[PDB]
Design a protein around this nucleic acid. Structure first.
Ligand SMILES: [Mg+2]
Ligand SMILES: [Mg+2]
Ligand SMILES: [Mg+2]
Ligand SMILES: [Mg+2]
Ligand SMILES: [Mg+2]
Ligand SMILES: [Mg+2]
Ligand SMILES: [Mg+2]
Ligand SMILES: [Mg+2]
Ligand SMILES: [Mg+2]
Ligand SMILES: [Mg+2]
Ligand SMILES: [Mg+2]
Ligand SMILES: [Mg+2]
Ligand SMILES: [Mg+2]
Ligand SMILES: [Mg+2]
Ligand SMILES: [Mg+2]
Ligand SMILES: [Mg+2]
Ligand SMILES: [Mg+2]
Ligand SMILES: [Mg+2]
Ligand SMILES: [Mg+2]
Ligand SMILES: [Mg+2]
Ligand SMILES: [Mg+2]
Ligand SMILES: [Mg+2]
Ligand SMILES: [Mg+2]
Ligand SMILES: [Mg+2]
Ligand SMILES: [Mg+2]
Ligand SMILES: [Mg+2]
Ligand SMILES: [Mg+2]
Ligand SMILES: [Mg+2]
Ligand SMILES: [Mg+2]
Ligand SMILES: [Mg+2]
Ligand SMILES: [Mg+2]
Ligand SMILES: [Mg+2]
Lengths: 166, 286, 97, 148, 80, 140, 101
RNA sequence: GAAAUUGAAACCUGGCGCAAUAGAUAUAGUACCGCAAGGGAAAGAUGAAAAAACCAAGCAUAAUAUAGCAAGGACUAACCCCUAUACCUUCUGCAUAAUGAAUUAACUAGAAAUAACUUUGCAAGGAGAGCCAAAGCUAAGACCCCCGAAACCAGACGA
RNA sequence: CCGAGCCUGGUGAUAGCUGGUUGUCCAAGAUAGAAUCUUAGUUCAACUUUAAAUUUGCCCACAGAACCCUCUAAAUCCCCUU
RNA sequence: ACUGAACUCCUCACACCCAAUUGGACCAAUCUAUCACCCUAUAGAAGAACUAAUGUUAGUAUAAGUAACAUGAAAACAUUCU
RNA sequence: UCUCUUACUUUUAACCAGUGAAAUUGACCUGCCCGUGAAGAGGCGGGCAUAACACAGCAAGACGAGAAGACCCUAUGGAGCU
């Protein structure tokens, strides 16, 4: 096994110079060996990927999936430790930067079939990983405008050369 | 576990390369890196450019004021300033000044001889370009001036490296005389002009204004702008050629996406023809 | 991935231990010692292999002949089967006949 | 293959042979073993050939390290800042002399695919073709099916 | 599938026929008769075969030099 | 296991490095990668012939275009230039068409002139003086 | 090969020229020489007196490795060769014309 | 496939053996399977003290945009253009037919003679008794795979 | 899982049959047959490979190679010179 | 007339496009002798190289989050009801 | 049963939550028509078509998948019976 995500909170950066923008706080937190499919967990992880902490918690609270409450617990723990240990100013002033599911260590069992024959059943486990970053959630990338497309196309035309010549 | 050493060693080497690629080390000056002898290097610098340099003068050319300050401060901090009293190394000011002055004068001389029709402003701007931080630093980098220069910080800031390069010019001036140094300027700085449009080197604003002033200087009629050729006027991709006529005689024709852009282009074409910076101009004689 | 992520502990070989230093001594016992002893007598190993050489089948026949009686029952059975198999292989099988 | 590899256009460092030709090779470092069969040829090279090479190429600084090593190497550095490491392991004197001369002749440009076997900054003298070249002008510049 | 003869194919055929017709003509006039020809190249032909025979007979193992054997000692040539 | 391969990683990597830019499991799975890489290398070797061929058809296409601007056909241009004892290959003629259009017009003019000299010679059966551009420089 | 060259132009020659780097050579065999307003073209070559083109050797290199691969299916036929071709880079220094017509 | 006949030297604590799919089946004849005789596994890795970094497949980071053995030639440019009928094995010959492969890691298949050839030593003799010899004899080098039946017999174990 | 149980041994049974047979590079290299419980195989010849010895090999021109049957051609064999 | 190959020429180079088979030049890694000492040299050895055996063991995919599986109701969770 | 099928209930189903297999799989960026390949083409040629992604149906094709067959032939392969 590897447990690198835990070690990520142990990084210490040198003190910042006065003439430097303030570094946003990063918090790394994970739950290991969740009895739940990583594939099922993925959807919930994807859901809250860009969201603020409060938005994410709201969405998870009213979700019907088993993994939703597990992510809610992990998020709450992360929010708490962010303020306590990592010197985050406001508990609300956090957004999900990374939200991922990974495979866990699994167990093989036997599934009996309707003859002498059988199948191998696998008890799924997963890890949930989250990275929280201090600050407002970054604005979503705006949909490409007609003018943007037009500009790109002109750029393509202007870029072209006489090929296979002097 | 397989018995053997060679495979494990090879793999260690691979992992080392992977670590280096993933996390590249901060740039380090060549002086600090092994296989370095300063005296051998400066001699080789001289020989590379097929020129005779005074060793002492060239040494002086490479040393910088910031380096001297840093060395003094380091000696003060270490506590051996009184113990290791030594004559202060000569600064970079004198040689750099002499080199810069000579470079500018010879560039103006070359440019004036080759292009007589050019105005003073234009030649000034072209000399400025050739003596600019960009090209001079590029030449300096690729002549191993950065390697030999003694500086406070690495990589060497562009201002310092420019100064050092002109110091080298100055050292050569004192060593080999003006004519040899002129040949050096021609071989390095002038060659940067090759494959470049005039207005790429000399940035201009309102070329039509420049053109009308130039034509009234030569006592001819003000240019008349006419649409020579046109394609796809209503489309998002039009081509327009506009021509400039002086007493119903063609001086320049310029293409553009719009009429206004075409006008500007025609004006620039006109200026190129007037000043003699045509694409088909006689190439520089070396 | 079947490659080790650390170097193996370095091998130190004493090239001048007593065994290596005195290797080859008495190989010329016969020619320098009035032929009182053959060099083959210096060979230390199995009774059946002392100063003799032969292929797998020949070696097995020799082992059975010489130490066969003293062998363990299971070992003797294996040797019998080995000879029986090697007989069939060498006599009945191959490319050249 | 080309699609699997980077490419570049034909280029010089600083318009090398335009004003005056400047040898691109700057430094040449040799790692040779006093004892060791790999560096045998290398040793013999250092004994006879390196002095003459140094005389022939004054612009290049030659370093000879003479340290314990299983494989002897030559490191070539160029003015543009390229570094090339070449193994002279179990090579004859002739082979090493050949390789060293090649390094001297080479510039610092990467030995990758060169897209065009020629390079020009002024391809045209008469003026690059456009659709309106080889087209006649018309009176009053009238488009087809234009009344006025 | 039926194949048909084009004009190009006919032209290609007649071109070759024209060449071979000229070939016939140049084979028509021999410089020497058969009787005059007899034994003119015999001496050269013979000597050529003796050259072949000499090559065949000269087959033998190459020379072996003491220098070649001793030069292998140079594998352990070292600096002091 | 008295002897077993310790260098298999590097043997795999030699093939795999060429497969990196492929899509699918071909890029990473050796069994599949090796087959595609052999094909890639074979194609690469055979492509040299096509490169040369494709360049020439490109040149001919370009020459045809430029000739047609001057109202001349491709066979006319090439044929008559050869008859004028000028030996300019198709690569250079295509380059001239793009970059030196005045020179190309001159060559088109020369070809056209020679073409008319040919027609005049053909029409004028018997004893007639040779065309000015028709006459050929003799080398001995 | 026919090379359309101008002043300060680089060309890659796919062979070793047996010339030291920095050596200036005159390229004979000029077919066509053109300006903005005139062209002179020889039959097939222009005279020596008429035109002079000068180049210099600036670089002598190996080409990037070229793969030669042979494969025939179901025959157990597979060959691989790596070739590098010697190369020379020439800088066309000057083109000069003398009044000889 | 003999025998008469000849003749046999004696120092254990060593290894050009394996190193967790290897070497014993073995951490164990255990767990498990079978009424029974019987078959028969798998696996462990900190540090002096616990009274102290990168790499297989699979995925995720990061779904997708006309078109086609997945590439190659390329190109300013990923794609667009042009070129290109997967690999192995079998059948008298043919592949495009049929066979085999989800993928990764590890494991998994040419063993020896007579006679010849090559290189030495000695030479009408060679060989450290025997054997060969009308240039031979002595020594060395160098050629001969893997998996799979239905069966047959012997001795046990089973109503 | 009985046209003759199961287990162990003989046993690495045997299989002219099926499948498989693992680095790189170069070179030479293809279709007369005979016998055989033989045509799914093997042995000899033919062809192929290597090494060695020695002289001819191939291409060929005059001359030359049957009558009978009442017919019969392209050709073939042999062969100096070249 | 032109287009049109790996044919031929051109610049440079050259052992570098057949099945079975046969001859030759090299060689990965390992162990040993002696070297060497950031990973090698000359030799001697050998369980000496795997894109393929419905190969063996292990891991992880695909089909697939599919097929399939499960708890009568209310409530004080005392109990009652169906 | 059918002419000639319809309506309703339960199971299944589909959706939501939990748990979670199997045969199968060379790689696939997996179209249509005509032709070619002795039949037979998603992939070859000539035409045509073509933003990209789910979910639910279907069984015309992928000589669709798994064994087990039946037919003919072969083995100097077995076995039972007479
Ligand atoms: Mg049951
Ligand atoms: Mg074990
Ligand atoms: Mg075991
Ligand atoms: Mg991976
Ligand atoms: Mg296509
Ligand atoms: Mg299959
Ligand atoms: Mg009973
Ligand atoms: Mg009973
Ligand atoms: Mg068998
Ligand atoms: Mg061959
Ligand atoms: Mg018989
Ligand atoms: Mg038979
Ligand atoms: Mg048979
Ligand atoms: Mg004859
Ligand atoms: Mg062609
Ligand atoms: Mg070729
Ligand atoms: Mg050829
Ligand atoms: Mg050749
Ligand atoms: Mg093996
Ligand atoms: Mg493998
Ligand atoms: Mg397999
Ligand atoms: Mg489904
Ligand atoms: Mg269901
Ligand atoms: Mg359903
Ligand atoms: Mg569900
Ligand atoms: Mg399965
Ligand atoms: Mg069809
Ligand atoms: Mg098609
Ligand atoms: Mg569907
Ligand atoms: Mg198909
Ligand atoms: Mg039988
Ligand atoms: Mg039998």
């Amino acid at each position: 096994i590897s447990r690198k995500w835990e070690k990520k909170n142990k990084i210490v950066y040198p003190p910042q110079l006065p003439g430097e923008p303030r570094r946003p706080a990063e918090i790394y937190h994970c739950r290991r060996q969740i009895k739940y499919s990583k594939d099922k967990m993925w959807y919930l992880a994807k859901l809250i990927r860009g969201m603020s902490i409060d938005q994410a918690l709201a969405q998870l609270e009213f979700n019907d999936k088993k993994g939703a409450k597990i992510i809610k617990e992990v998020l709450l723990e992360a929010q708490d430790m962010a303020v306590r240990d990592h010197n985050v100013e406001f508990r609300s002033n956090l957004y999900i930067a990374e939200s991922t599911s990974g495979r866990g260590q699994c167990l093989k069992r036997i599934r009996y079939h309707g003859r002498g024959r059988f199948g191998i059943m696998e008890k799924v486990y997963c890890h949930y990983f989250v990275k929280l970053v201090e600050g407002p959630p970054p604005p979503p990338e705006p949909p490409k405008t007609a003018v943007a497309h037009a500009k790109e196309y002109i750029q393509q035309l202007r870029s072209r050369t006489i090929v296979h010549t002097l | 576990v397989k018995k053997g050493f060679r495979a494990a060693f090879r793999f260690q080497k691979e992992l080392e390369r992977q670590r280096l690629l993933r996390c590249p080390p901060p740039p380090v000056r060549r002086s600090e890196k092994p296989n370095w002898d300063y005296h051998a290097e400066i001699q080789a610098f001289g020989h590379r450019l097929q020129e005779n340099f005074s060793l002492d003068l060239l040494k002086t050319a490479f040393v910088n004021s910031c380096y001297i300050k840093s060395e003094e401060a380091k000696r003060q901090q270490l506590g051996i300033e009184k113990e290791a009293v030594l004559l202060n190394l000569k600064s970079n000011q004198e040689l750099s000044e002499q080199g810069t002055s000579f470079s500018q004068t010879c560039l103006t001389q070359f440019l004036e001889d080759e292009y007589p029709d050019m105005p003073t402003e234009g030649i000034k701007n072209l000399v400025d370009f050739l003596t600019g931080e960009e090209v001079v630093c590029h030449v300096a980098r690729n002549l191993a001036v950065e390697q030999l220069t003694l500086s406070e910080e690495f990589p060497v800031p562009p201002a310092v490296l420019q100064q050092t390069f002109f110091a080298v010019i100055g050292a050569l001036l004192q060593s080999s005389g003006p004519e040899r140094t002129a040949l050096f300027i021609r071989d390095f700085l002038i060659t940067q002009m090759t494959g470049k449009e005039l207005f790429e080197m000399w940035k201009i604003i309102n070329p039509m204004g420049l053109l009308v002033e130039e034509l009234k200087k030569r006592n001819v009629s003000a240019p008349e702008s006419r649409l020579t050729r046109q394609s796809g006027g209503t489309t998002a991709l039009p081509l327009y050629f506009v021509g400039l006529y002086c007493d119903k005689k063609l001086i320049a024709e310029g293409p553009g996406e719009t009429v206004l852009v075409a006008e500007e282009e025609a004006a620039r074409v006109a200026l190129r023809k007037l000043y003699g910076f045509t694409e088909n101009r006689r190439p520089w004689n070396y | 991935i079947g490659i080790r992520l650390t170097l193996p502990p370095p091998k130190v070989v004493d090239r001048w231990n007593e065994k290596r230093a005195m290797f080859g001594v008495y190989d010329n016992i016969g020619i320098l010692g009035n032929f009182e002893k053959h060099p083959k007598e210096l060979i230390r190993g199995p009774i059946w292999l002392r100063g003799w050489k032969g292929n797998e089948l020949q070696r097995c026949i020799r082992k059975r002949k010489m130490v066969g009686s003293r062998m363990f029952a299971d070992d003797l059975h294996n040797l019998n089967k080995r000879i029986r198999y090697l007989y069939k292989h060498f006599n009945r099988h191959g490319k050249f006949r | 293959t080309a699609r699997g590899t980077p490419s570049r256009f034909l280029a010089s460092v600083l318009h090398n042979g335009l004003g005056r030709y400047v040898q691109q090779l700057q430094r040449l470092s040799f790692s040779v073993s006093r004892d060791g069969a790999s560096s045998r040829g290398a040793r013999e090279f250092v004994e006879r050939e390196v002095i003459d090479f140094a005389r022939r190429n004054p612009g290049v600084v030659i370093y000879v390290n003479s340290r314990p090593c299983c494989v002897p190497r030559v490191v070539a550095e160029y003015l543009n800042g390229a570094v090339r490491e070449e193994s002279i392991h179990c090579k004859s004197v002739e082979e090493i002399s050949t390789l060293v001369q090649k390094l001297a002749d080479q510039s610092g440009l990467d030995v990758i695919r060169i897209r065009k076997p020629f390079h020009t900054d002024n391809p045209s003298i008469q003026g690059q073709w456009h659709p309106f070249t080889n087209k006649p002008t018309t009176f009053r510049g009238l488009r087809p099916r234009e009344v006025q | 599938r039926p194949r048909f003869v084009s004009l190009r194919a006919k032209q290609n055929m007649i071109r070759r026929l024209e060449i071979e017709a000229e070939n016939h003509y140049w084979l028509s006039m021999p410089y020497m008769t058969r009787e005059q020809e007899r034994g003119h190249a015999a001496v050269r032909r013979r000597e050529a075969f003796e050259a072949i025979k000499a090559a065949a007979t000269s087959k033998f193992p190459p020379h072996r030099f003491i220098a070649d054997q001793l030069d292998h000692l140079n594998v352990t040539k070292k600096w002091s | 296991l008295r002897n077993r391969v310790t260098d298999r990683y590097f043997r795999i990597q030699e093939v795999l490095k060429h497969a990196r830019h492929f899509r699918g499991r071909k890029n990473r799975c050796y069994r599949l990668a090796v087959r595609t890489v052999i094909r890639a290398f074979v194609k690469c070797t055979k492509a040299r012939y096509l490169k040369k061929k494709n360049m020439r058809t490109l040149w001919i296409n370009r020459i045809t275009a430029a000739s047609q601007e001057h109202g001349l056909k491709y066979p006319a241009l090439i044929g008559n230039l050869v008859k004028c004892q000028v030996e300019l290959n198709r690569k250079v003629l295509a380059d001239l068409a793009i970059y030196e259009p005045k020179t190309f017009k001159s060559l088109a003019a020369l070809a056209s002139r020679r073409r008319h000299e040919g027609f005049a010679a053909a029409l004028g059966d018997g004893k007639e003086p040779e065309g000015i551009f028709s006459r050929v420089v003799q080398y001995h | 090969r026919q090379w359309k060259v101008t002043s300060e132009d680089l060309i890659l020659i796919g062979n070793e020229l047996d010339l030291a780097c920095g050596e200036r050579i005159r390229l004979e065999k000029v077919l066509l020489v053109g300006a903005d307003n005139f062209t002179l073209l020889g039959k097939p070559l222009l005279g020596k007196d008429l035109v002079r083109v000068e180049a210099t050797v600036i670089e002598k290199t190996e080409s990037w490795p070229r793969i030669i691969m042979r494969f025939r299916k179901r025959k157990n036929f597979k060959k691989k060769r790596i070739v590098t071709t010697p190369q020379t880079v020439l800088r066309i220094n000057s083109i000069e014309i003398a009044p000889c017509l």
